[PDB]
Amino acid sequence: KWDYDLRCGEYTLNLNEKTLIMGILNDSFSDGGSYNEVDAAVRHAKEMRDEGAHIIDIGSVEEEIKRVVPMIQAVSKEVKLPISIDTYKAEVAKQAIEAGAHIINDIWGAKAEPKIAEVAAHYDVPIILMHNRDNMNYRNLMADMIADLYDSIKIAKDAGVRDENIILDPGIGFAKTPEQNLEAMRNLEQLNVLGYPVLLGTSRKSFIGHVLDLPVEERLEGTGATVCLGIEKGCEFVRVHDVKEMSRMAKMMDAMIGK
Amino acid sequence: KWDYDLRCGEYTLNLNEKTLIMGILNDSFSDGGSYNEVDAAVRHAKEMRDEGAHIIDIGSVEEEIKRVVPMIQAVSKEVKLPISIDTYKAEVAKQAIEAGAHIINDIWGAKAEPKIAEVAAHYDVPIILMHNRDNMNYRNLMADMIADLYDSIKIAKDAGVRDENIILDPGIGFAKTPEQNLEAMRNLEQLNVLGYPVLLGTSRKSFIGHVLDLPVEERLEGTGATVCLGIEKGCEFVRVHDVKEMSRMAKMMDAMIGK
Ligand SMILES: Nc1nc2[nH]nc(CCC(=O)O)c(=O)c2c(=O)[nH]1
Numbered sequence: 227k228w229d230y231d232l233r234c235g236e237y238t239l240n241l242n243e244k245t246l247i248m249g250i251l252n253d254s255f256s257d258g259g260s261y262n263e264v265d266a267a268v269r270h271a272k273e274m275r276d277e278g279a280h281i282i283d284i285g286s287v288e289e290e291i292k293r294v295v296p297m298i299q300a301v302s303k304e305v306k307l308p309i310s311i312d313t314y315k316a317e318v319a320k321q322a323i324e325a326g327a328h329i330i331n332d333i334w335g336a337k338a339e340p341k342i343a344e345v346a347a348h349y350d351v352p353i354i355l356m357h358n359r360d361n362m363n364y365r366n367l368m369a370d371m372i373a374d375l376y377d378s379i380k381i382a383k384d385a386g387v388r389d390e391n392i393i394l395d396p397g398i399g400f401a402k403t404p405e406q407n408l409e410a411m412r413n414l415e416q417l418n419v420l421g422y423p424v425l426l427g428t429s430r431k432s433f434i435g436h437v438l439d440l441p442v443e444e445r446l447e448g449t450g451a452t453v454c455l456g457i458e459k460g461c462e463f464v465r466v467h468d469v470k471e472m473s474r475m476a477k478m479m480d481a482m483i484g485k
Numbered sequence: 486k487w488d489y490d491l492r493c494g495e496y497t498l499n500l501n502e503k504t505l506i507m508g509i510l511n512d513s514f515s516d517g518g519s520y521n522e523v524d525a526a527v528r529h530a531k532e533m534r535d536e537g538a539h540i541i542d543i544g545s546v547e548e549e550i551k552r553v554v555p556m557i558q559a560v561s562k563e564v565k566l567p568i569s570i571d572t573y574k575a576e577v578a579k580q581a582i583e584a585g586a587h588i589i590n591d592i593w594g595a596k597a598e599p600k601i602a603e604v605a606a607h608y609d610v611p612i613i614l615m616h617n618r619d620n621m622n623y624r625n626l627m628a629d630m631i632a633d634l635y636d637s638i639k640i641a642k643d644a645g646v647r648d649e650n651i652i653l654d655p656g657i658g659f660a661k662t663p664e665q666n667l668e669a670m671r672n673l674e675q676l677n678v679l680g681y682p683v684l685l686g687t688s689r690k691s692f693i694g695h696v697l698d699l700p701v702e703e704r705l706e707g708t709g710a711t712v713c714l715g716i717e718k719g720c721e722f723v724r725v726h727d728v729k730e731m732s733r734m735a736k737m738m739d740a741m742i743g744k
């Protein structure tokens with residue numbers, strides 16, 4: 227039970243009533259801004275909003291800014307929903323919050339560019355710290371993830387990030403072998419000891435294919451399974467591609483566990 | 486971990502390698518036997534077999550026999566898979582095992598017709614005892630289910646049913662209000678204390694509709710959720726309509742829990 231709300235500027239996400247669904251949002255001849263790109267992005271944001279999403283996830287440094295900023299301007303204007311920027315770069319994160327993004331989403335947990343934590347602290351936005359490393363050489367998988375995530379928190383907190391603006395992510399499908407991904411899934415509740423909300427990103431990932439022997443477009447039931455087990459282990463967010471399907475699955479879980 | 490195998494005549498089901506999927510099998514102008522009925526039933530058994538099922542569930546006393554026997558004769562002849570007979574009637578169960586059914590499936594847990602337990606004992610077949618009662622007046626839901634199931638076991642055991650041929654079923658969607666169905670789902674692990682394999686039948690049931698507000702044909706993600714939570718609480722079998730989808734979901738769960 228959370229004694230606070232996730233504060234994202236205009237919108238506020240309660241962490242107790244339901245599992246929050248973060249939808250993953252989708253051009254040559256262009257460096258960024260086109261009518262085809264930004265319109266296709268808006269149609270997708272609109273659709274995801276209609277089918278249950280609570281957050282929209284939008285994700286060459288000069289290029290990244292000129293691609294992603296126009297998309298954030300449009301979607302935040304036209305879809306009444308908090309937006310997260312999927313970057314590990316300090317400068318891109320700044321840009322995106324300027325252009326209207328509400329939440330930062332760092333796949334390197336402030337280790338790639340520590341200054342990103344300083345960006346987060348400054349704009350007073352929620353930051354997702356995902357587990358990652360440049361190797362798969364674990365002494366004890368869970369004990370090391372928790373160790374590594376903790377170092378991400380230290381960087382965030384030293385930078386002035388408030389406890390309430392910190393969300394953790396086990397980084398499934400990162401620096402982990404098929405068997406190590408399943409181990410983290412099996413032991414996800416361990417992350418709860420750190421005292422922070424947890425986000426789970428497993429949608430359509432490679433290890434589902436390893437188990438089911440099924441290609442990326444055939445991983446819906448597999449995704450569902452990982453979402454269900456994640457919610458049962460106390461996840462606050464799930465980052466999925468199939469918003470309609472996962473929303474229903476999340477909703478039925480919530481009823482059963484009594485969230 | 487089970488130190489024995491579920492013995493069903495010609496076929497043997499191991500209870501440790503995977504969650505066993507039981508598929509639910511599907512005429513006017515006829516009292517039983519027609520070419521349309523039994524062929525449509527065989528096509529369905531064949532399909533379910535092809536998409537992951539491990540058991541086929543086939544389910545006016547004179548009528549019941551003349552309807553169900555011809556279907557069992559055909560399916561057991563043409564599909565290499567154990568068959569269960571979904572009845573609570575002693576005479577129908579006898580007939581069906583004579584006609585080739587391998588497992589009895591009693592929705593009244595030997596309380597409607599105690600002589601059915603005697604049928605089961607005699608042919609030495611596995612029997613599923615499902616929780617049921619003629620009222621919803623519970624002191625303590627779980628404590629009462631376990632009490633009631635135990636009385637089913639007493640009838641079975643007095644009749645000569647061996648411990649290894651007994652499987653339990655919480656009887657979700659029976660004698661339980663929408664809120665009581667969710668409570669049993671939340672507390673399913675409690676059934677494990679009785680020492681018997683558990684089968685979970687929640688496919689497309691009314692309470693999924695109550696939660697999701699969705700009609701019977703729109704309850705696939707909801708079913709999945711109940712299956713995933715059930716496997717996580719240690720179910721050995723799931724009784725589902727959507728064999729393709731649930732098999733994949735069962736398989737991905739099994740990988741994650743380490744079954
Ligand atoms: N927080 C978080 N951010 C991500 N960004 N990008 C990716 C990669 C894109 C995709 O494969 O889903 C990802 O998996 C995650 C994640 O699991 N979690």
Ligand SMILES: Nc1nc2[nH]nc(CCC(=O)O)c(=O)c2c(=O)[nH]1
Nearest residue numbers: 571590592613615654656686687724
């Ligand atoms: N063991 C068992 N047998 C059944 N027979 N028939 C039914 C009813 C048919 C259907 O609605 O699925 C059932 O739900 C069960 C069950 O949940 N479990």
